[PDB]
Amino acid sequence: DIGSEFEGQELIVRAAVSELDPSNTIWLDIEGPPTDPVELALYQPAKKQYIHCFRKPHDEKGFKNGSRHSHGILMKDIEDAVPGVLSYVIGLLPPNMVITTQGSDDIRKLLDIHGRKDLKLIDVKFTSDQARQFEHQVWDKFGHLCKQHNGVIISKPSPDEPHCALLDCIMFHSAMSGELPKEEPIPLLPKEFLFFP
Ligand SMILES: [Mg+2]
Ligand SMILES: [Zn+2]
């Protein structure tokens, strides 16, 4: 408990989680399977804020599937992610918090694995077309928020846009609201802390 080389990261995450208001809508999305997640985002539109972090997968062979066909995150761009950050964020979430999601199955599993059966999920149950209404607009306006999706998406016309946990949250909220947010949410976790020097 005393002397950790990751004391800073821990304090940063604690400070970020303390900013979450359990009275407001909070979105959560992950990329990667719930057993080996590689990207996590929480987004609270009412406070114009988000928590966003990464982790290196433990199953590198399995990671290839999501990388090529879903999220487009290359191993090179997350191999230096500080381990445990993603789990620490989940561990700190307030008791019994209501979390908004699109497609609850994998998130439920993720949270259950983390022993967070107390967290409650709303699934907005969008169709794919509904969920991604604002995809191009979100990448145009907010794409600079995540530069970690550099792999071309293969179809197992034109390549699909890769899925980013953060931009997914933003575009899902935009779909629910009918419009993109006023302007630019603010990161609660400084990017430089998500990765090894
Ligand atoms: Mg997603
Ligand atoms: Zn991303």
Residue numbers in the entry: 358 to 513, 524 to 564
Quote the original article.
Additionally, we provide for the first time a high-resolution crystal structure of an active exoribonuclease domain of Tacaribe arenavirus (TCRV) NP. To determine the structural basis for the possible differential activity of TCRV NP in IFN suppression, we crystallized the TCRV NP-C domain (residues 364–569) and determined its three-dimensional structure at 1.8 Å. The overall structure of TCRV NP-C was very similar to that of LASV NP-C with a root mean square deviation of 1.30 Å from residue 364 to 561. The five conserved catalytic residues from TCRV NP-C were located at almost identical positions as those of the LASV NP-C with some minor conformational changes. The potential dsRNA-interacting interface of TCRV NP also largely resembled that of LASV NP. Specifically, residues Arg-489, Gln-459, and Ser-427 in TCRV NP were located at identical positions as the corresponding residues Arg-492, Gln-462, and Ser-430 of the LASV NP, which coordinated the binding of the cleaving strand. A noted difference was that residues Ser-485, Gly-423, and Pro-390 in TCRV NP were located at the corresponding positions of residues Lys-488, Asp-426, and Arg-393 of the LASV NP, respectively. It is noteworthy that these residues are not phylogenetically conserved, and that single substitution at these residues in LASV NP did not significantly affect the exoribonuclease activity of the proteins in vitro or their IFN suppression in cells. We found that TCRV NP could process both ss- and dsRNA templates with similar efficiency and substrate preference as those of the LASV NP. Taken together, our data strongly suggest that TCRV NP, like the NP proteins of LASV and other arenaviruses, has active 3′-5′ exoribonuclease activity and can effectively suppress IFN production, results that are in sharp contrast to the previously published report.
Lassa virus (LASV) nucleoprotein (NP) is the only known 3′-5′ exoribonuclease that can suppress type I interferon (IFN) production possibly by degrading immune-stimulatory RNAs. NP is a multifunctional protein involved in viral genomic RNA encapsidation, viral RNA synthesis, and immune evasion. Our structural, biochemical, and cell-based analyses have demonstrated that NP encodes a functional 3′-5′ exoribonuclease of the DEDDH family at its C terminus and that this RNase activity plays a strikingly important role in IFN suppression. We therefore propose a novel immune evasion mechanism in which NP suppresses the IFN induction by selectively degrading these immune-stimulatory RNAs.
